[PDB]
């Protein structure tokens, strides 16, 4: 599914991401914009053979199992395919684990390079929340 901006903000809010670990909702929407263009089915393969999955482009080396990333850990205990669902629950639950992990949202390269230090509130401007 390809989410609308405000549609995704509402979904993320419902699943508890607003101000999770101190990161306002705009941050999460901005990260999803630039990671996947709000498309839950997005996948991207990395040089190291790992693959990134879903709206938040969660990586198979650490977080999910895709059966083709040797000696990977599956810290969210899910198949990577679960992250491609129109229901973003699995992605949100895994992202909460990631951002608690000590590096915060810097774990998302697009967030660090395109969202961090910008006016991220603009991403939820105009939405009914
Ligand atoms: Cl929308
Ligand atoms: Cl949802
Ligand atoms: Cl959730
Ligand atoms: Cl942090
Ligand atoms: N939720
Ligand atoms: N949740
Ligand atoms: N949802
Ligand atoms: Na893995
Ligand atoms: Pt939902
Ligand atoms: Pt939830």
From Swiss-Prot:
GO terms for biological process: cell wall macromolecule catabolic process; defense response to bacterium; defense response to Gram-negative bacterium; defense response to Gram-positive bacterium; killing of cells of another organism. The keyword Signal applies. The active site is at residues 35, 52. Its EC number is 3.2.1.17. Its main location: secreted. It comes from the Eukaryota. Disulfide bonds join 6-127, 30-115, 64-80, 76-94. It holds the Pfam family Lys. GO terms for cellular component: cytoplasm; endoplasmic reticulum; extracellular space. Coiled coil: none annotated. One of its GO terms (molecular function) is lysozyme activity. The keyword Isomerase does not apply. It catalyses: Hydrolysis of (1->4)-beta-linkages between N-acetylmuramic acid and N-acetyl-D-glucosamine residues in a peptidoglycan and between N-acetyl-D-glucosamine residues in chitodextrins. It is found in: Secreted. It is an enzyme of class 3 (hydrolase). InterPro entries: Glyco_hydro_22 (IPR001916), Glyco_hydro_22_CS (IPR019799), Glyco_hydro_22_lys (IPR000974), Lysozyme-like_dom_sf (IPR023346). Residues 1-129 form the C-type lysozyme domain. Substrate binds at residue 101. In the egg white and polymorphonuclear leukocytes. Keywords: Allergen, Antimicrobial, Bacteriolytic enzyme, Disulfide bond, Glycosidase, Hydrolase, Secreted, Signal. Monomer. Lysozyme C is capable of both hydrolysis and transglycosylation; it also shows a slight esterase activity. It acts rapidly on both peptide-substituted and unsubstituted peptidoglycan, and slowly on chitin oligosaccharides. Belongs to the glycosyl hydrolase 22 family. Lysozymes have primarily a bacteriolytic function; those in tissues and body fluids are associated with the monocyte-macrophage system and enhance the activity of immunoagents. Has bacteriolytic activity against M.luteus. This is Lysozyme C.
